[PDB]
Design a binder for this molecule. Structure first.
Ligand SMILES: CCCn1cnnc1-c1cccc(N2Cc3c(cc(N(C)C)nc3CNC)C2=O)n1
Ligand SMILES: CCCn1cnnc1-c1cccc(N2Cc3c(cc(N(C)C)nc3CNC)C2=O)n1
Lengths: 288, 289
């Protein structure tokens, strides 16, 4: 990263508590030694022998995002084989941290979260970025009740992998166009995020994604079977027709028929005039 | 592997000549100390901490092939951080080695090679195997003028890659079905080899594949564009309508419409009589004289 701080952030911050992991690295809550401002520091072990591509892509994504629904980026430090990504501290943690305490979210709270995530996704997709890891654990809530997408580790790993593989995929001159297409584009597109959002909406309503207790490898196989049916909400009577329809359309099996983030923003569920931060601030009130 | 020889291959063979590289490793001409038979030994560096999955997959591909048009497999040796794969030796080298001396092949010579490669591809595809690196450099010729496909390095790497990637692709519960599909199936199928054969037929005719002067990364981009026109032979009048048609159909852009290896074996260009190894023996006489 051209803007890296070649200094130890511990000279400027006190590490207060561990905030868990993620795709890679350890996240800490940190307080500025003088200002008192709180930040999240994601520490990753570096080495002169280690490939910097993944971290380089993650920093590039975060630094070029300037949107209210994407975690803010403050800079990165490099000192004594440790890289520290400095980001916005989100006081309420992830939606998973929240629902594990409060129980299932109400339909209005899920509708607001969905609107906010779709705003973030519409922005990412407009910058030709794909999150590829949407789930309750990657949707953060700050004390202000703001919804922020986080952890671009999978997105960074995918992008770095696609670029790294190119040298070894073989000679392009004799390559079939469909092989070149998967080499450059990966075999899918940004609409994979829309599906993940539909699953996240079931997770917020039910406290688990569909097939949560099934071995992760068997899930992959089940999903590729020709008979695979998109998941549905379990408690039909609890939810409005708009919510069932939101699940139906975001979980469109064919990606050619699945609606874009911008199209989804006009959906009846997420375009309700009454959706506001008050819904989340209420959720944080229950947390206390 | 319980079939590997845990010994120096020089106990059994004398190394005679360097035969170049390939996708990975170095190949040598060798002579069996007991029988005097010639073989090719491919030596690959294999450290104790290195991933064995690619080489395991290459030997599995080779060992379960029993078809004249695929180099025979004799066995493998592991010794002093080197893995040696023992295969059939092909006395005239690759078609690329040959045409760099002889110049362009004749249409009958091309037809015979295409038939032979198609027979090997029909067999591979019958086993759910994909070559994925068909080109003149990988079509080997023996002193009898017989044709063998070689170098499953790319095929082995793709197979090892699919299995290795799986653990790191992220949680599956929130994943879109198309993400899971590409993770388990790859994104394309065996018909990629039919396209590669068509490009190879142009290569044998013109001494290089289409777009060879273009930067390889730019070639990848050009092929991914909607509107990419499949390439054609340059000199229209020099080639029969049958040969131009063979190129047109093997280079069908949509893989859903591209014919199989078995389908291509019924094409008049490769089903014509007079297609035999004597055509390549003529080519080898040109190489010598
Ligand atoms: C995807 C989250 C990790 N991550 C992976 N890449 N960038 C980040 C990242 C980025 C910015 C903030 C944060 N976090 C995470 C977190 C936070 C607070 C908190 N509280 C107050 C209980 N809990 C947790 C998480 N608990 C399990 C917080 O500010 N994380
Ligand atoms: C396909 C490329 C190598 N390879 C990669 N995986 N398996 C193999 C492989 C397997 C079996 C034989 C052979 N070869 C290659 C070769 C030969 C002879 C020869 N002569 C007499 C000049 N020249 C060359 C190649 N020259 C550039 C021969 O028998 N190779």
């Amino acid at each position: 990263d051209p803007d890296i701080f070649n200094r130890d952030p511990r000279d400027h911050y006190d590490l207060l508590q561990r905030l868990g992991g993620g795709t890679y690295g350890e996240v800490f809550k940190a307080r500025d030694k003088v200002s008192g401002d709180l930040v999240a520091l994601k520490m990753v072990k570096m080495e002169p022998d280690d490939d910097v591509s993944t971290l380089q892509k993650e920093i590039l994504i975060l630094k070029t995002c300037r949107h209210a629904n994407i975690v803010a980026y403050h800079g990165s430090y490099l000192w004594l084989q440790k890289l520290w990504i400095c980001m916005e501290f989100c006081g309420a943690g992830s939606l998973q941290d929240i629902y594990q305490v409060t129980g299932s979210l109400s339909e209005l709270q899920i509708s607001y979260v969905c609107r906010e995530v779709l705003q973030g996704l519409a922005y990412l997709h407009s910058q030709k970025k794909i999150h590829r890891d949407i789930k309750g654990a990657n949707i953060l809530i700050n004390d202000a009740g703001e919804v922020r997408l986080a952890d671009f580790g999978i997105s960074a790993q995918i992008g770095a992998e696609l670029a790294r593989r190119l040298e070894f995929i073989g000679t392009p001159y004799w390559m079939a166009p469909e092989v070149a297409a998967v080499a450059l584009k990966g075999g899918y597109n940004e609409l994979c995020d829309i599906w993940s959002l539909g699953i996240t909406a079931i997770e917020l309503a039910e406290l688990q994604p569909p097939l949560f207790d099934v071995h992760p490898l068997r899930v992959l196989f089940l999903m590729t079977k020709s008979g695979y049916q998109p998941p549905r909400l379990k408690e039909k009577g609890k939810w409005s027709a708009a919510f069932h329809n939101f699940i139906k359309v975001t979980l469109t099996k064919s990606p050619k028929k699945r609606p874009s983030a911008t199209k989804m923003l006009s959906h009846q569920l997420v375009s309700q005039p009454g959706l506001n931060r008050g819904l989340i601030l209420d959720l944080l009130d229950k947390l206390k």
